Amino acid sequence: WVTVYYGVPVWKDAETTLFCASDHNVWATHACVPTDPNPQEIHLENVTEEFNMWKNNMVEQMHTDIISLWDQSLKPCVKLTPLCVTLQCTNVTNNITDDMRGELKNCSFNMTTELRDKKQKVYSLFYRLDVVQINSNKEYRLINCNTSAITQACPKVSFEPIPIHYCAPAGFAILKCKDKKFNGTGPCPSVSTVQCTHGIKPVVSTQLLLNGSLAEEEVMIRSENITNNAKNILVQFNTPVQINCTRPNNNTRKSIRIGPGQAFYATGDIIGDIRQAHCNVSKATWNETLGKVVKQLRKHFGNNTIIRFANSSGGDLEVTTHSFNCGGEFFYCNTSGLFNSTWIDSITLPCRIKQIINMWQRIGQAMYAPPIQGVIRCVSNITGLILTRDGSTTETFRPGGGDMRDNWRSELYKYKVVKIEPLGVAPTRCKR
Amino acid sequence: FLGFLGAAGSTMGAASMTLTVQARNLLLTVWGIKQLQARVLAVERYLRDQQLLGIWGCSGKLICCTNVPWNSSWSNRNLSEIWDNMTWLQWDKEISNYTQIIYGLLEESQNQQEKNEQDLL
Amino acid sequence: FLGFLGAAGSTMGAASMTLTVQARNLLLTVWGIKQLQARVLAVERYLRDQQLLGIWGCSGKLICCTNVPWNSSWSNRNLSEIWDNMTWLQWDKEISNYTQIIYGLLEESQNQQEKNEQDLL
Amino acid sequence: FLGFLGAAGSTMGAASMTLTVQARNLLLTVWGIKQLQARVLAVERYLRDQQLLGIWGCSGKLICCTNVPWNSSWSNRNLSEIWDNMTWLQWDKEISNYTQIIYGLLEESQNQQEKNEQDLL
Amino acid sequence: EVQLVETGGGLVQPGGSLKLSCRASGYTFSSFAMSWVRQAPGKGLEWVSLINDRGGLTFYVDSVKGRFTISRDNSKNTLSLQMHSLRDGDTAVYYCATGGMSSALQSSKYYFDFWGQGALVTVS
Ligand SMILES: *[C@@H]1O[C@H](CO)[C@@H](O[C@@H]2O[C@H](CO)[C@@H](O[C@@H]3O[C@H](CO)[C@@H](O)[C@H](O[C@H]4O[C@H](CO)[C@@H](O)[C@H](O)[C@@H]4O)[C@@H]3O)[C@H](O)[C@H]2NC(C)=O)[C@H](O)[C@H]1NC(C)=O
Ligand SMILES: *[C@@H]1O[C@H](CO)[C@@H](O[C@@H]2O[C@H](CO)[C@@H](O)[C@H](O)[C@H]2NC(C)=O)[C@H](O)[C@H]1NC(C)=O
Ligand SMILES: *[C@@H]1O[C@H](CO)[C@@H](O[C@@H]2O[C@H](CO)[C@@H](O)[C@H](O)[C@H]2NC(C)=O)[C@H](O)[C@H]1NC(C)=O
Ligand SMILES: *[C@@H]1O[C@H](CO)[C@@H](O[C@@H]2O[C@H](CO)[C@@H](O)[C@H](O)[C@H]2NC(C)=O)[C@H](O)[C@H]1NC(C)=O
Ligand SMILES: *[C@@H]1O[C@H](CO)[C@@H](O[C@@H]2O[C@H](CO)[C@@H](O)[C@H](O)[C@H]2NC(C)=O)[C@H](O)[C@H]1NC(C)=O
Ligand SMILES: *[C@@H]1O[C@H](CO)[C@@H](O)[C@H](O)[C@H]1NC(C)=O
Ligand SMILES: *[C@@H]1O[C@H](CO)[C@@H](O)[C@H](O)[C@H]1NC(C)=O
Ligand SMILES: *[C@@H]1O[C@H](CO)[C@@H](O)[C@H](O)[C@H]1NC(C)=O
Ligand SMILES: *[C@@H]1O[C@H](CO)[C@@H](O)[C@H](O)[C@H]1NC(C)=O
Ligand SMILES: *[C@@H]1O[C@H](CO)[C@@H](O)[C@H](O)[C@H]1NC(C)=O
Ligand SMILES: *[C@@H]1O[C@H](CO)[C@@H](O)[C@H](O)[C@H]1NC(C)=O
Ligand SMILES: *[C@@H]1O[C@H](CO)[C@@H](O)[C@H](O)[C@H]1NC(C)=O
Ligand SMILES: *[C@@H]1O[C@H](CO)[C@@H](O)[C@H](O)[C@H]1NC(C)=O
Ligand SMILES: *[C@@H]1O[C@H](CO)[C@@H](O)[C@H](O)[C@H]1NC(C)=O
Ligand SMILES: *[C@@H]1O[C@H](CO)[C@@H](O)[C@H](O)[C@H]1NC(C)=O
Ligand SMILES: *[C@@H]1O[C@H](CO)[C@@H](O)[C@H](O)[C@H]1NC(C)=O
Ligand SMILES: *[C@@H]1O[C@H](CO)[C@@H](O)[C@H](O)[C@H]1NC(C)=O
Ligand SMILES: *[C@@H]1O[C@H](CO)[C@@H](O)[C@H](O)[C@H]1NC(C)=O
Ligand SMILES: *[C@@H]1O[C@H](CO)[C@@H](O)[C@H](O)[C@H]1NC(C)=O
Ligand SMILES: *[C@@H]1O[C@H](CO)[C@@H](O)[C@H](O)[C@H]1NC(C)=O
Ligand SMILES: *[C@@H]1O[C@H](CO)[C@@H](O)[C@H](O)[C@H]1NC(C)=O
Ligand SMILES: *[C@@H]1O[C@H](CO)[C@@H](O)[C@H](O)[C@H]1NC(C)=O
Ligand SMILES: *[C@@H]1O[C@H](CO)[C@@H](O)[C@H](O)[C@H]1NC(C)=O
Ligand SMILES: *[C@@H]1O[C@H](CO)[C@@H](O)[C@H](O)[C@H]1NC(C)=O
Ligand SMILES: *[C@@H]1O[C@H](CO)[C@@H](O)[C@H](O)[C@H]1NC(C)=O
Ligand SMILES: *[C@@H]1O[C@H](CO)[C@@H](O)[C@H](O)[C@H]1NC(C)=O
Ligand SMILES: *[C@@H]1O[C@H](CO)[C@@H](O)[C@H](O)[C@H]1NC(C)=O
Ligand SMILES: *[C@@H]1O[C@H](CO)[C@@H](O)[C@H](O)[C@H]1NC(C)=O
Ligand SMILES: *[C@@H]1O[C@H](CO)[C@@H](O)[C@H](O)[C@H]1NC(C)=O
Ligand SMILES: *[C@@H]1O[C@H](CO)[C@@H](O)[C@H](O)[C@H]1NC(C)=O
Ligand SMILES: *[C@@H]1O[C@H](CO)[C@@H](O)[C@H](O)[C@H]1NC(C)=O
Ligand SMILES: *[C@@H]1O[C@H](CO)[C@@H](O)[C@H](O)[C@H]1NC(C)=O
């Protein structure tokens, strides 16, 4: 009666190592498998499968893979140890608008030349956020000098978030939930098997989620525990909100040789006048979008509840502002103009710019972002929010972020990895 | 018709006609190592299943009819329910606790068969 | 007599007596990875061929006589030309375009055979 | 009863009932490479033995009765001494020098058998 | 309610050939094995042939083993029986029946569940 079958369509939850595939990058370059131009997807009829986006180890793998790629891409670049010197700084005062008063420092210093016998007197411009006043009222040091070594990113490697596809190894499969209005947990019908994930762009940001995927029909609210104020709420929009950012300053770049084969890229004089970096969000669009978000929050908090939006709480710049990398430069924008309302042209968000960047939440590994010549203009899609609930007739929501896993969890929520188990036995009516 | 796992929601007797579909899908130094480990594992898992079929006397087959009786205590159901209503995922859950017992019995009946066949030659 | 590939220029029926000759020849961290990849690949290629023979019902054989008829459209030649004049390299070119058709037919006839043999037990 | 190699000191006919016991036990970047090499080798060694059984016509078996006669010059002993007094370790030493001869004969008789079976079909 | 309807010629010369057929309805044709049974003009029943549900396996009584062919087409819901050579001893009513075998993955039958009315064949 026992009959053995091999090739049985059975699987179990499993954790494995997925590989990257893709169609001068920081991330996926040549250490990545070329994609299949005609990838497959198979609908599974009558299959109900339980998904849990909050326990999805694909998120942990992506987090680890992008950090490791980031570091490998800085390892061979120029060390800026020679730059951690006493700086003599004054204010940049030439044609400065009020918003930029005190933002730029004109600093001179004694730098190493190619020969070990000689030094050179050089100068460069720094942002106020890059330096620390010491002592002699003009003496400054770079901010990272008492904490860490700093390296210069190689100005040939772009930070463009080129999409990565994750693919399963043989013996494993990735299941995709196609059930619209899937909130991240529990069972869903309409499951399909895919060879690989769609391309996911490793966009790094806080508060606002940029350039991601959109909800198919309705704005969705997803959380690990909606009643736990210690958990974040991810909000996925069903329409994009366009945001236009810029650094309206025609910068120049100069190369300072600091050794036999090494150079420091310094910000030189700025052409034209000095203006503040900023981002524009269409006001009507933002209001309509916020409209939809509240309508959905009411489903969990009550339709007679007062839902208020407020700006961020205190913390470091990387937490309280909207951080993003665009055009090759790192912007920190003030979002208090977006989250200032009860219930529910353009809105201008002022921004600050930094050159010394501490990625993720690490201490000890700083990088210097070389300046970009000319003027930067960026156009991107806001596709979602990270909100934290501040908490008896009202609830206040504030922008959150800083934990990058939340930005990938929002794209990988539809995927699950399973292991195929091809043997099975069953009673039949035959005998060897 | 159906591709890989397309029969997963089908009944056990509707499935089990697609066995070759699933069988064929089983096949910077740090990235190199991670991928070699994934590939080596896929091979090791494949070979363990093949070794197991071999010791049960089912080498080279997708469907292997054995000489072990079915204990009604493992699953007291008729062929009609098992092959026409149930899917393989449901079945796997139903008899998960008896898998090792069944495997032990399959190995033992093959050892006896293999020896009887030697004595007859 | 002949060693590996020594029969390559021989006719198909003179060759095919040397099948075990070829079958047995199929078996600083950067250098380590390059060699592991070469070794892992050799294993994966070997296993794919063995899996394929298995699903066609030819496991464990070097010569396997199947139950699929030969379509004259694949190659309209008599046994005398194929086995006495042609070499295997020439033959492989002649029917390259029909390889996938033939493979599909071999898999299907085995699925039918395997099921008929279950019903007879 | 006995686990892996527990039958090593037993006689040849007491052992050889434990064949599945042994068969199943055959299955910072620098550390990663050392372990991948160990795993790749285990697979390669396993497959060479399986390939060899295949070309001798013993695929899928632990005990395979062949059609090659035993030359008394390889070991002039009766079944009683070989199966009841000797252990497998002792036997392996006794006929070590004839292993390659025997293997060559096994391959050749299979080639002849395989062809005769084709002519009969 | 199911139906089995035998059709086919009823008068042949010995040494000739004859094809009978049976149209089925009211059940899934493809789920059942089928057979032919003869009723001698003045005696009892005799089993002649059996075909599997998928049409791949056929069985015969020794007396027709080298003469008759049983075939099935699941797309038309029909059986056929091709007689050749023909003997006087083959005169009988030929009944189409459902049952006889099993498919080894379902409960066995080994009995005949449904019968048609029978074609009458005379060998002159
Ligand atoms: C959200 O998606 C949008 C759409 O893709 C994305 O905006 C795009 O960013 C890229 C890179 O910043 C822009 O492409 C640049 O366009 C300027 C135009 O003059 C070029 O000069 C740039 O080339 C320089 O850098 C290259 C780096 O490899 C060098 O090779 C080259 O020689 C130049 O130095 C580059 O082409 C693209 O135009 C925009 N698209 C739009 C609509 O603006 C946006 O950034 C994404 N959001 C986030 C946060 O990333
Ligand atoms: C930053 O300070 C430097 C001097 O350390 C300024 O450069 C000088 O500008 C005067 C203007 O008359 C020139 O005559 C000097 O020759 C310049 N010195 C050098 C070394 O080039 C520089 O312009 C200041 N930059 C800003 C933006 O204020
Ligand atoms: C490196 O120097 C900075 C600047 O002095 C130190 O950070 C300051 O710590 C004091 C302690 O009361 C705070 O009040 C300042 O606001 C901090 N400044 C900044 C810019 O954060 C920093 O702790 C020093 N690091 C080490 C390792 O000594
Ligand atoms: C973000 O922008 C807002 C206003 O655009 C800044 O808000 C001011 O903060 C000071 C701090 O005490 C208040 O006294 C002002 O009244 C605030 N203005 C308004 C209109 O409320 C805010 O500080 C900026 N945040 C950051 C981090 O720069
Ligand atoms: C912002 O979102 C819109 C809508 O998803 C994107 O526009 C679509 O891009 C796809 C890409 O092939 C086109 O096929 C669609 O027709 C586009 N829609 C429209 C209305 O043009 C848009 O590109 C996104 N913006 C960014 C910067 O990614
Ligand atoms: C401000 O811009 C004008 C434009 O030509 C320039 O002439 C002037 O010198 C600038 N001011 C300073 C302080 O450089
Ligand atoms: C630079 O501008 C800031 C603006 O508040 C002012 O406090 C500071 O004293 C200025 N420094 C110099 C050297 O003028
Ligand atoms: C450079 O070194 C000389 C040496 O005396 C010193 O006087 C000068 O102030 C230094 N320059 C700067 C900008 O510190
Ligand atoms: C998501 O849907 C499941 C379905 O049971 C529900 O239990 C869960 O609470 C929902 N999540 C939220 C945040 O409400
Ligand atoms: C969700 O958060 C509330 C807040 O107290 C907690 O009591 C509840 O147990 C949490 N739910 C789960 C499933 O842990
Ligand atoms: C933002 O709006 C202001 C309104 O005058 C406009 O001048 C500015 O250029 C806009 N910025 C962007 C990035 O479009
Ligand atoms: C962004 O730039 C595009 C360019 O055409 C413009 O149409 C759009 O309105 C701008 N968005 C905002 C918020 O200004
Ligand atoms: C946003 O929507 C609310 C709905 O009451 C409306 O009152 C408010 O004026 C809107 N704001 C804008 C900028 O249109
Ligand atoms: C919220 O709207 C739903 C819609 O049916 C309704 O059932 C529910 O009672 C409403 N809650 C309040 C507080 O009115
Ligand atoms: C939020 O707005 C309040 C208004 O007084 C301001 O004090 C606070 O600093 C703002 N938060 C941030 C991060 O700017
Ligand atoms: C928040 O809304 C009030 C309403 O009058 C406005 O005065 C205030 O400036 C707004 N805050 C920000 C940061 O725009
Ligand atoms: C920046 O200044 C250079 C000086 O020649 C000019 O050619 C360039 O067009 C300017 N860029 C912008 C964006 O105005
Ligand atoms: C899914 O269930 C329906 C219910 O009858 C069935 O007809 C269909 O064939 C099932 N799907 C598959 C792949 O068999
Ligand atoms: C069936 O299993 C029970 C325990 O579940 C065992 O006692 C019984 O002997 C088994 N029957 C046979 C025939 O082995
Ligand atoms: C056999 O199948 C029938 C379905 O009609 C079911 O009711 C019965 O319980 C089954 N027999 C066993 C062994 O349970
Ligand atoms: C099992 O399949 C048969 C097929 O006709 C169906 O009639 C029966 O109701 C099914 N039983 C269950 C429990 O689904
Ligand atoms: C398998 O073991 C678990 C352990 O709790 C038990 O709950 C389950 O019912 C067992 N399965 C069967 C079929 O008895
Ligand atoms: C090469 O061709 C000649 C031509 O007759 C043939 O005799 C010879 O045997 C061929 N070589 C081999 C290896 O058969
Ligand atoms: C032989 O191949 C032709 C097409 O090349 C096809 O139409 C024909 O049916 C095939 N013959 C058989 C017996 O399958
Ligand atoms: C059979 O072989 C002869 C060689 O004498 C050849 O001329 C003929 O064309 C062959 N037949 C076919 C099927 O081509
Ligand atoms: C094929 O081999 C036979 C063997 O005698 C030979 O006579 C014949 O000419 C060969 N034909 C061709 C085309 O080489
Ligand atoms: C195989 O396909 C190529 C494609 O050009 C064709 O030229 C060749 O003749 C084909 N081979 C056969 C045997 O038809
Ligand atoms: C070891 O030798 C003794 C000697 O008689 C024997 O009885 C015993 O069984 C042997 N050990 C094993 C594992 O057979
Ligand atoms: C047995 O081996 C001897 C050499 O050791 C050899 O001469 C003899 O022919 C062999 N006997 C047989 C039957 O092959
Ligand atoms: C056979 O066994 C006996 C043990 O009683 C031994 O004395 C004799 O030598 C053996 N025969 C051979 C072939 O040596
Ligand atoms: C071989 O085993 C038999 C088993 O009874 C024993 O009597 C005999 O003495 C043993 N011979 C040797 C040489 O150990
Ligand atoms: C095997 O070869 C060695 C080589 O010295 C020899 O001593 C030994 O006796 C040989 N073994 C046999 C069984 O003849």
Coordinates of N, CA and C in Angstrom, one line a residue, chain C residues 13-114:
Chain C
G13 N 28.8 3.4 -35.3 CA 28.8 2.0 -34.8 C 30.1 1.4 -34.3
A14 N 31.2 2.1 -34.5 CA 32.5 1.7 -34.2 C 32.8 2.3 -32.8
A15 N 32.3 3.4 -32.7 CA 32.3 4.2 -31.5 C 31.1 3.6 -30.8
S16 N 30.7 4.2 -29.7 CA 29.6 3.5 -29.0 C 29.9 2.1 -28.5
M17 N 31.2 1.9 -28.2 CA 31.8 0.7 -27.6 C 32.8 1.2 -26.6
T18 N 32.9 2.5 -26.6 CA 33.8 3.3 -25.9 C 33.1 4.3 -24.9
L19 N 31.8 4.0 -24.7 CA 31.0 4.9 -23.9 C 31.5 5.1 -22.5
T20 N 32.2 4.1 -21.9 CA 32.7 4.2 -20.6 C 33.9 5.0 -20.5
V21 N 34.6 5.2 -21.7 CA 35.8 6.0 -21.7 C 35.5 7.4 -21.6
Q22 N 34.4 7.9 -22.2 CA 34.1 9.3 -22.1 C 33.3 9.5 -20.8
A23 N 32.4 8.5 -20.4 CA 31.7 8.8 -19.2 C 32.5 9.0 -18.0
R24 N 33.6 8.3 -17.9 CA 34.5 8.4 -16.7 C 35.4 9.6 -16.7
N25 N 35.4 10.4 -17.7 CA 36.1 11.6 -17.8 C 35.3 12.8 -17.5
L26 N 34.0 12.6 -17.1 CA 33.2 13.7 -16.8 C 33.1 13.9 -15.3
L27 N 33.8 13.1 -14.5 CA 33.7 13.0 -13.1 C 32.3 13.2 -12.6
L28 N 44.9 34.8 -1.9 CA 44.9 33.7 -2.8 C 43.6 33.0 -2.8
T29 N 42.7 33.6 -2.1 CA 41.3 33.2 -1.9 C 40.6 33.3 -3.2
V30 N 41.1 34.1 -4.1 CA 40.5 34.3 -5.4 C 40.7 33.0 -6.2
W31 N 41.8 32.4 -6.1 CA 42.1 31.2 -6.9 C 41.3 30.1 -6.4
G32 N 41.1 30.1 -5.0 CA 40.3 29.1 -4.4 C 38.8 29.1 -4.9
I33 N 38.3 30.3 -5.0 CA 37.0 30.5 -5.5 C 36.9 30.1 -7.0
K34 N 37.8 30.5 -7.8 CA 37.7 30.1 -9.2 C 37.7 28.6 -9.4
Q35 N 38.5 27.9 -8.6 CA 38.5 26.4 -8.7 C 37.3 25.8 -8.1
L36 N 36.7 26.3 -7.0 CA 35.5 25.7 -6.5 C 34.4 25.9 -7.5
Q37 N 34.4 27.1 -8.2 CA 33.3 27.2 -9.2 C 33.4 26.2 -10.3
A38 N 34.7 26.0 -10.7 CA 34.8 25.0 -11.8 C 34.4 23.6 -11.4
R39 N 34.7 23.2 -10.1 CA 34.3 21.9 -9.6 C 32.8 21.8 -9.3
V40 N 32.2 22.8 -8.8 CA 30.8 22.8 -8.6 C 30.1 22.7 -9.9
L41 N 30.5 23.4 -10.9 CA 29.9 23.3 -12.2 C 30.0 21.9 -12.8
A42 N 31.2 21.3 -12.7 CA 31.3 19.9 -13.2 C 30.3 19.0 -12.6
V43 N 30.0 19.1 -11.3 CA 29.0 18.3 -10.6 C 27.7 18.6 -11.1
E44 N 27.3 19.9 -11.2 CA 26.0 20.3 -11.6 C 25.7 19.8 -13.0
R45 N 26.6 19.9 -13.9 CA 26.4 19.4 -15.3 C 26.2 17.9 -15.3
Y46 N 27.0 17.2 -14.6 CA 26.9 15.8 -14.5 C 25.5 15.4 -14.0
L47 N 25.0 16.0 -12.9 CA 23.8 15.6 -12.4 C 22.6 16.0 -13.3
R48 N 22.7 17.1 -14.0 CA 21.6 17.3 -14.9 C 21.4 16.2 -16.0
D49 N 22.5 15.7 -16.5 CA 22.4 14.6 -17.5 C 21.8 13.4 -16.8
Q50 N 22.2 13.1 -15.6 CA 21.7 11.9 -15.0 C 20.3 12.0 -14.6
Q51 N 19.8 13.2 -14.2 CA 18.4 13.4 -14.0 C 17.6 13.2 -15.2
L52 N 18.1 13.7 -16.3 CA 17.4 13.6 -17.5 C 17.3 12.2 -18.0
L53 N 18.3 11.4 -17.8 CA 18.2 10.0 -18.2 C 17.2 9.3 -17.3
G54 N 17.1 9.7 -16.0 CA 16.2 9.1 -15.1 C 14.8 9.3 -15.5
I55 N 14.4 10.6 -15.8 CA 13.0 10.8 -16.2 C 12.6 10.2 -17.5
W56 N 13.6 9.8 -18.4 CA 13.3 9.1 -19.6 C 13.3 7.6 -19.4
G57 N 13.5 7.1 -18.2 CA 13.6 5.7 -17.8 C 14.8 5.0 -18.2
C58 N 15.9 5.7 -18.3 CA 17.2 5.1 -18.7 C 18.3 5.2 -17.6
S59 N 17.8 5.3 -16.4 CA 18.8 5.4 -15.3 C 19.7 4.2 -15.2
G60 N 21.0 4.5 -15.0 CA 22.0 3.4 -14.8 C 22.5 2.8 -16.1
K61 N 22.0 3.3 -17.3 CA 22.4 2.7 -18.5 C 23.3 3.6 -19.4
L62 N 24.1 3.0 -20.3 CA 24.8 3.8 -21.2 C 24.1 3.7 -22.6
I63 N 23.4 2.6 -22.8 CA 22.6 2.4 -24.0 C 21.2 2.1 -23.5
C64 N 20.3 2.9 -23.9 CA 18.9 2.7 -23.5 C 17.9 2.7 -24.6
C65 N 17.3 1.6 -24.8 CA 16.4 1.4 -25.9 C 15.0 1.8 -25.4
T66 N 14.4 2.8 -26.1 CA 13.1 3.5 -25.6 C 12.0 3.0 -26.5
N67 N 10.8 3.5 -26.2 CA 9.6 3.1 -26.9 C 9.0 4.2 -27.7
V68 N 9.8 5.2 -28.2 CA 9.4 6.3 -29.0 C 9.9 6.0 -30.5
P69 N 9.0 6.1 -31.5 CA 9.3 5.8 -32.9 C 10.1 7.0 -33.4
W70 N 10.8 6.7 -34.5 CA 11.6 7.8 -35.1 C 10.9 8.4 -36.3
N71 N 10.7 9.7 -36.3 CA 10.0 10.4 -37.3 C 11.0 10.5 -38.5
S72 N 10.6 10.1 -39.7 CA 11.5 10.2 -40.8 C 11.9 11.6 -41.1
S73 N 11.1 12.6 -40.7 CA 11.4 14.0 -40.9 C 12.6 14.5 -40.1
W74 N 13.0 13.7 -39.1 CA 14.1 14.2 -38.3 C 15.4 13.9 -39.0
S75 N 15.4 12.8 -39.7 CA 16.6 12.3 -40.5 C 16.2 11.2 -41.4
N76 N 16.0 11.4 -42.7 CA 15.6 10.4 -43.6 C 16.7 9.6 -44.1
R77 N 17.3 8.8 -43.3 CA 18.5 8.0 -43.7 C 18.3 6.5 -43.2
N78 N 19.0 5.6 -43.8 CA 18.9 4.2 -43.4 C 20.0 3.9 -42.4
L79 N 19.8 2.8 -41.6 CA 20.8 2.4 -40.6 C 22.1 2.3 -41.2
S80 N 22.3 1.9 -42.4 CA 23.6 1.7 -43.0 C 24.3 3.1 -43.0
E81 N 23.6 4.1 -43.5 CA 24.4 5.4 -43.5 C 24.7 5.9 -42.1
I82 N 23.7 5.8 -41.2 CA 23.9 6.3 -39.9 C 24.9 5.6 -39.1
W83 N 24.9 4.3 -39.0 CA 25.8 3.6 -38.2 C 27.2 3.3 -38.8
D84 N 27.2 3.1 -40.2 CA 28.5 2.8 -40.8 C 29.2 3.9 -41.5
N85 N 28.6 5.1 -41.9 CA 29.3 6.1 -42.6 C 29.6 7.3 -41.6
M86 N 28.5 7.7 -40.9 CA 28.6 8.9 -40.1 C 29.3 8.7 -38.8
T87 N 29.9 9.8 -38.4 CA 30.5 9.9 -37.0 C 29.5 10.6 -36.1
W88 N 29.8 10.6 -34.8 CA 28.8 11.2 -33.9 C 28.8 12.7 -34.0
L89 N 29.9 13.3 -34.4 CA 30.0 14.8 -34.5 C 29.1 15.2 -35.7
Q90 N 29.2 14.4 -36.8 CA 28.3 14.8 -38.0 C 26.9 14.6 -37.7
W91 N 26.5 13.5 -37.0 CA 25.2 13.3 -36.6 C 24.6 14.3 -35.7
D92 N 25.4 14.8 -34.7 CA 24.9 15.8 -33.9 C 24.6 17.0 -34.6
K93 N 25.4 17.4 -35.6 CA 25.0 18.6 -36.4 C 23.7 18.3 -37.2
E94 N 23.6 17.2 -37.8 CA 22.4 16.9 -38.6 C 21.1 17.0 -37.9
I95 N 21.0 16.5 -36.7 CA 19.7 16.6 -36.0 C 19.7 17.5 -34.8
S96 N 20.5 18.5 -34.8 CA 20.5 19.5 -33.7 C 19.1 20.1 -33.5
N97 N 18.4 20.5 -34.6 CA 17.2 21.1 -34.5 C 16.0 20.3 -34.0
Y98 N 16.2 19.0 -33.8 CA 15.2 18.2 -33.4 C 15.4 17.7 -32.0
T99 N 16.4 18.1 -31.4 CA 16.8 17.5 -30.1 C 15.7 17.8 -29.0
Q100 N 15.1 19.0 -29.0 CA 14.2 19.3 -28.0 C 12.9 18.5 -28.2
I101 N 12.5 18.3 -29.5 CA 11.3 17.5 -29.8 C 11.5 16.1 -29.3
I102 N 12.6 15.5 -29.6 CA 12.8 14.2 -29.2 C 12.8 14.1 -27.7
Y103 N 13.5 15.0 -27.0 CA 13.5 14.9 -25.5 C 12.1 15.0 -25.0
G104 N 11.3 15.9 -25.5 CA 9.9 16.0 -25.0 C 9.1 14.7 -25.2
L105 N 9.3 14.0 -26.3 CA 8.6 12.8 -26.5 C 9.1 11.7 -25.6
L106 N 10.4 11.7 -25.3 CA 10.9 10.6 -24.4 C 10.4 10.8 -23.0
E107 N 10.2 12.0 -22.5 CA 9.7 12.3 -21.2 C 8.2 11.8 -21.1
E108 N 7.5 12.1 -22.2 CA 6.1 11.8 -22.2 C 5.8 10.3 -22.3
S109 N 6.6 9.6 -23.1 CA 6.3 8.2 -23.1 C 6.7 7.5 -21.8
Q110 N 7.7 8.0 -21.1 CA 8.0 7.4 -19.8 C 6.9 7.7 -18.8
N111 N 6.3 8.9 -18.8 CA 5.2 9.1 -17.9 C 4.1 8.2 -18.1
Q112 N 3.8 7.9 -19.3 CA 2.7 7.0 -19.6 C 3.0 5.5 -19.2
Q113 N 4.2 5.1 -19.4 CA 4.7 3.8 -19.1 C 4.6 3.6 -17.6
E114 N 5.1 4.6 -16.9 CA 5.2 4.5 -15.4 C 3.8 4.4 -14.8

